mmCIF file of C-alpha atoms in Angstrom:
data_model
loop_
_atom_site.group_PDB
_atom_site.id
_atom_site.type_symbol
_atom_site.label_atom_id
_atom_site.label_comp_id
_atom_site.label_asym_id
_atom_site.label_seq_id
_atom_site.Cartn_x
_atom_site.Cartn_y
_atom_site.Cartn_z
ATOM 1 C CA UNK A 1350 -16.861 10.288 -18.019
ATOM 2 C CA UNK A 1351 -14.095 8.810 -15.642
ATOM 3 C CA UNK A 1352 -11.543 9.211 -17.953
ATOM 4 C CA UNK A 1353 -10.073 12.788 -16.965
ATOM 5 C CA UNK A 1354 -7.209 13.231 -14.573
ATOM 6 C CA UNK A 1355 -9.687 14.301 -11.672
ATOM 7 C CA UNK A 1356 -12.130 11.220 -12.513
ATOM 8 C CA UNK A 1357 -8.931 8.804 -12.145
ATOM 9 C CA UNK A 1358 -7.727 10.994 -8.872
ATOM 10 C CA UNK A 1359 -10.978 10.485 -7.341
ATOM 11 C CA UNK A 1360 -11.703 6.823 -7.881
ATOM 12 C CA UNK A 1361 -8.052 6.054 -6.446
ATOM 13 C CA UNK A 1362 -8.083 8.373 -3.838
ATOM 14 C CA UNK A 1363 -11.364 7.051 -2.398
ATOM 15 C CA UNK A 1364 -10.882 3.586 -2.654
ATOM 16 C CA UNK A 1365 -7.776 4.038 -0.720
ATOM 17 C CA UNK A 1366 -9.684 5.709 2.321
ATOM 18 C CA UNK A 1367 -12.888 2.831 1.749
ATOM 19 C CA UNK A 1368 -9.496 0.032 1.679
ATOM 20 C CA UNK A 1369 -7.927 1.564 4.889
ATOM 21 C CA UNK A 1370 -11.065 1.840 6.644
ATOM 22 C CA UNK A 1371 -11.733 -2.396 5.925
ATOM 23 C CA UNK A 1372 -8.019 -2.363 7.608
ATOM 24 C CA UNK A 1373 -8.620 -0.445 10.588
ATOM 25 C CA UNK A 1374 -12.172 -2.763 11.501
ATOM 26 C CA UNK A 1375 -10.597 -5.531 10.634
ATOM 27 C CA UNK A 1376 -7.432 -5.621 11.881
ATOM 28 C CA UNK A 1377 -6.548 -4.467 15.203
ATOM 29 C CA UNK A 1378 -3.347 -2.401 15.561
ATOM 30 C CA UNK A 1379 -2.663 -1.128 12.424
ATOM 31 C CA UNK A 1380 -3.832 2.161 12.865
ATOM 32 C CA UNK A 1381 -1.204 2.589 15.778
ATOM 33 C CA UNK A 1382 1.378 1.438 13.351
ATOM 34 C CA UNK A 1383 0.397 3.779 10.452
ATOM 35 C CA UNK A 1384 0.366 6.228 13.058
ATOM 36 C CA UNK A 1385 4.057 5.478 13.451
ATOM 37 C CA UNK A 1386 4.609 5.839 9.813
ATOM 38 C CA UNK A 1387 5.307 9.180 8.148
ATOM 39 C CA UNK A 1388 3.394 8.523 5.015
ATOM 40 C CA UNK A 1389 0.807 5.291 4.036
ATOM 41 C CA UNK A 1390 0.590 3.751 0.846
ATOM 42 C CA UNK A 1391 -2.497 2.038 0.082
ATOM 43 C CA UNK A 1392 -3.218 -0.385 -2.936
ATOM 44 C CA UNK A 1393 -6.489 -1.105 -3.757
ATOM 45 C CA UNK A 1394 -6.153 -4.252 -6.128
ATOM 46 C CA UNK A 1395 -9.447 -5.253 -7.233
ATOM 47 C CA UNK A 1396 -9.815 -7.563 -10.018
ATOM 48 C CA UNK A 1397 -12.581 -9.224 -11.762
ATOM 49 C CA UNK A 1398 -12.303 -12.380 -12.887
ATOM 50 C CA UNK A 1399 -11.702 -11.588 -16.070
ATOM 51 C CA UNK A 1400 -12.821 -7.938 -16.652
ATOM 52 C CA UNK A 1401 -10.102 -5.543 -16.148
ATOM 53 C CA UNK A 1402 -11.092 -2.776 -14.203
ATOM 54 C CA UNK A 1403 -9.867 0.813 -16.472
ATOM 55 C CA UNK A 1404 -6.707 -1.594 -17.567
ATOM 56 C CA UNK A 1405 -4.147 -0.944 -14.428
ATOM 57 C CA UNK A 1406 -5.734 -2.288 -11.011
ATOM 58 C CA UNK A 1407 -2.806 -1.731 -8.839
ATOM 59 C CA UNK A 1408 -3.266 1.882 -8.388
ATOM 60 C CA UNK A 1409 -2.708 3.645 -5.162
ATOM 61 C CA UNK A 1410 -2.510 6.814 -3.150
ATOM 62 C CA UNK A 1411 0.533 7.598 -0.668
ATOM 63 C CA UNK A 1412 -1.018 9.703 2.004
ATOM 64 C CA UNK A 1413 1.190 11.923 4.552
ATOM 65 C CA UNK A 1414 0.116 13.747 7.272
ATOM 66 C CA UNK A 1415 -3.527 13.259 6.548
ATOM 67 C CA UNK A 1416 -2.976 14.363 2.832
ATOM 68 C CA UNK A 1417 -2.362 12.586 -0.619
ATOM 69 C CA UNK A 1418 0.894 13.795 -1.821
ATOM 70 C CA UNK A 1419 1.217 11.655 -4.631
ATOM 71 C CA UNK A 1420 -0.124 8.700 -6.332
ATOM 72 C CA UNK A 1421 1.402 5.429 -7.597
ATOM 73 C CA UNK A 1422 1.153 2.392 -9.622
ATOM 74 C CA UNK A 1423 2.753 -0.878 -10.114
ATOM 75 C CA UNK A 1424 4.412 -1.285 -13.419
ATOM 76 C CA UNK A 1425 5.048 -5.011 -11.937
ATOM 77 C CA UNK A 1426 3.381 -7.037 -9.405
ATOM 78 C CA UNK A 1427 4.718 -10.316 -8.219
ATOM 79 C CA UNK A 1428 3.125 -12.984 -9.368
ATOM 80 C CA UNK A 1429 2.153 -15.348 -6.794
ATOM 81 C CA UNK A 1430 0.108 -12.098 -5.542
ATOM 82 C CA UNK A 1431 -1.391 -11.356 -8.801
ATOM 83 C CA UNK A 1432 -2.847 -14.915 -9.259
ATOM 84 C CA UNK A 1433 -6.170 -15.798 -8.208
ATOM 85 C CA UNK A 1434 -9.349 -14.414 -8.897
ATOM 86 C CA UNK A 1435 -9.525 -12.066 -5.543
ATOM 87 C CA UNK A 1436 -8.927 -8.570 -4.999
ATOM 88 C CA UNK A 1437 -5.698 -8.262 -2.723
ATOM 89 C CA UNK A 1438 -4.612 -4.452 -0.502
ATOM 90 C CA UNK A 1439 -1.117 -3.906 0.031
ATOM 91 C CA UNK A 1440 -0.110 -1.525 2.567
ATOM 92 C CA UNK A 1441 3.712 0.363 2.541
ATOM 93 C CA UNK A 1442 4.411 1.910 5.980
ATOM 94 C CA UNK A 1443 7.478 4.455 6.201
ATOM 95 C CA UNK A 1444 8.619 5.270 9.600
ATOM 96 C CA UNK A 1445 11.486 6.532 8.542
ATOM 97 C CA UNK A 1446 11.964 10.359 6.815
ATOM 98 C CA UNK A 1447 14.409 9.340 4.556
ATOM 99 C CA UNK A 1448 12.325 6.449 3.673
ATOM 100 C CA UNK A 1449 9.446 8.684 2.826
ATOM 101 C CA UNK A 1450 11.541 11.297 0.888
ATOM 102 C CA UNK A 1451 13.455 8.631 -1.671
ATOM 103 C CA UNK A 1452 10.839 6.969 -2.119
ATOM 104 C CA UNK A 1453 8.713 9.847 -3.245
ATOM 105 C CA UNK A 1454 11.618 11.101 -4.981
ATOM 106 C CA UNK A 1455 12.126 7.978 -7.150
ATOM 107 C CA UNK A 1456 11.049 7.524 -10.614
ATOM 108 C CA UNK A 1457 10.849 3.417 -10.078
ATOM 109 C CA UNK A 1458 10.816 1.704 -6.036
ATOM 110 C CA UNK A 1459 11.460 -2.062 -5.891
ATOM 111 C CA UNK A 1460 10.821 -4.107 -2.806
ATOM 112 C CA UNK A 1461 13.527 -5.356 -1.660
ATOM 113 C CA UNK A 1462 15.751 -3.608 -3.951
ATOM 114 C CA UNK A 1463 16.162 -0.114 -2.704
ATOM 115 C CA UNK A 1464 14.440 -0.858 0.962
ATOM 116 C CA UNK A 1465 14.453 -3.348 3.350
ATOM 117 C CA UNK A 1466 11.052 -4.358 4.254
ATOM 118 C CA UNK A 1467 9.157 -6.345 6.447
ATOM 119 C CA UNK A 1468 6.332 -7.802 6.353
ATOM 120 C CA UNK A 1469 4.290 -7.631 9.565
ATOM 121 C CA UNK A 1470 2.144 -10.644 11.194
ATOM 122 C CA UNK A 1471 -0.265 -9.860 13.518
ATOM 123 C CA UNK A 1472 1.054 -10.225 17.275
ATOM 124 C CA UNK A 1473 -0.409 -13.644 19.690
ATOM 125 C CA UNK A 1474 -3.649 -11.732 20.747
ATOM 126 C CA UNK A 1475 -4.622 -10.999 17.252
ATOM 127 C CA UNK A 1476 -3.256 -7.676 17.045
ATOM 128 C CA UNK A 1477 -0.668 -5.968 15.336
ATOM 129 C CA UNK A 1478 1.975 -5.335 17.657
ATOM 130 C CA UNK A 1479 3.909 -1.625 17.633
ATOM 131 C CA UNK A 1480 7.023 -2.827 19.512
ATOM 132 C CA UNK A 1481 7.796 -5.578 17.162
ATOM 133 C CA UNK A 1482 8.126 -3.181 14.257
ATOM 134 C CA UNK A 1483 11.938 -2.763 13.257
ATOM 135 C CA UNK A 1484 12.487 -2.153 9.609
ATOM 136 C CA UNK A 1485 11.995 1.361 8.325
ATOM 137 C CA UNK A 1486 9.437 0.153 5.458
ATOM 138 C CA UNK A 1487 6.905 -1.572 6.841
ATOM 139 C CA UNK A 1488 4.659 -4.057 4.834
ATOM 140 C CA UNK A 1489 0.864 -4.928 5.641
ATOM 141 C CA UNK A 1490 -0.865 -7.280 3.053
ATOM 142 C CA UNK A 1491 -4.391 -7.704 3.887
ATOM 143 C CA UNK A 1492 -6.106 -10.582 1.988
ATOM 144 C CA UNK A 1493 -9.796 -12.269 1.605
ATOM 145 C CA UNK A 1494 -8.258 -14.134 4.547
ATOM 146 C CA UNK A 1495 -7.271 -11.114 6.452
ATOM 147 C CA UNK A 1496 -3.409 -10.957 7.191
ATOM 148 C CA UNK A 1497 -0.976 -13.444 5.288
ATOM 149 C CA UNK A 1498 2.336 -13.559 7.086
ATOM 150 C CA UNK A 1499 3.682 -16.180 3.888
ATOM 151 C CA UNK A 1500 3.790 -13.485 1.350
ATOM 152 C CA UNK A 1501 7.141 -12.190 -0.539
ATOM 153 C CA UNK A 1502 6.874 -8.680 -2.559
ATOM 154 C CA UNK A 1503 10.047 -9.060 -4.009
ATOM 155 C CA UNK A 1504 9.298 -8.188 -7.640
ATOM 156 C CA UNK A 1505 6.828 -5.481 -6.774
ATOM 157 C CA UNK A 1506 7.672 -2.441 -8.924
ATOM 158 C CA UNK A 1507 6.046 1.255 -8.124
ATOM 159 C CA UNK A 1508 6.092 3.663 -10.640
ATOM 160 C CA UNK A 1509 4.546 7.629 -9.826
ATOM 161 C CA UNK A 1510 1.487 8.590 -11.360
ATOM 162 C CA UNK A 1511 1.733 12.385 -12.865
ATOM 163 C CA UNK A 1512 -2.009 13.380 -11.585
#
């Protein structure tokens, strides 16, 4: 068991929806933001402390217009993110058509690389703030601690996942 293409659809599409949900509660103003965006990747990252979950952790689901169109994995994660022993959710926000089109035609999406991104800090009255967005790729890393404004992506590969 869990080792079919539907077994591997399911667990990532559901922990993206359980992952968004701890988003929405816990930080206010994202869901008006993802609203903005055209599609939502999620990344559920969590990691034991030293059992590997299946062998690739940083699996996610892009969801547009209510609906998983695709699903995607990181072939490379940067570092600094990848150490510790804590589970870490990265959210990509496209606001932008074209955004959402080459990236879900691309066989291999750097940050940094092929978009601009930004990475969004919660506004002065502890919510994310919609007018401050800018950049076409939006980027929402939610931590243990909640929102960490000092992280850089740059290095963070995304491969698609033929399921």
């Amino acid at each position: 068991g869990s080792a079919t293409n539907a077994s591997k659809r399911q667990a990532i599409d559901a922990s993206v929806d359980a992952t968004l949900s701890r988003l929405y509660s816990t930080v206010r103003g994202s869901r008006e933001l993802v609203a903005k965006s055209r599609g939502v990747l999620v990344f559920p990252d969590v990691i034991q402390a030293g059992l590997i979950i299946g062998g690739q952790t940083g699996n996610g689901a892009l969801r547009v217009g209510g609906a998983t169109v695709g699903y995607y994995n990181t072939s490379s994660l940067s570092v600094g993110l990848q150490a510790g022993a804590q589970s870490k959710a990265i959210v990509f926000l496209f606001m932008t058509q074209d955004a959402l089109d080459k990236f879900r035609n691309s066989d291999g999406w750097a940050a940094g690389a092929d978009a601009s991104v930004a990475l969004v800090k919660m506004g002065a009255n502890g919510a994310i703030d919609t007018t401050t967005a800018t950049a076409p790729v939006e980027v929402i890393v939610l931590t243990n601690a909640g929102l960490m404004g000092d992280v850089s992506i740059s290095g963070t590969k995304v491969t698609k996942l033929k399921i």
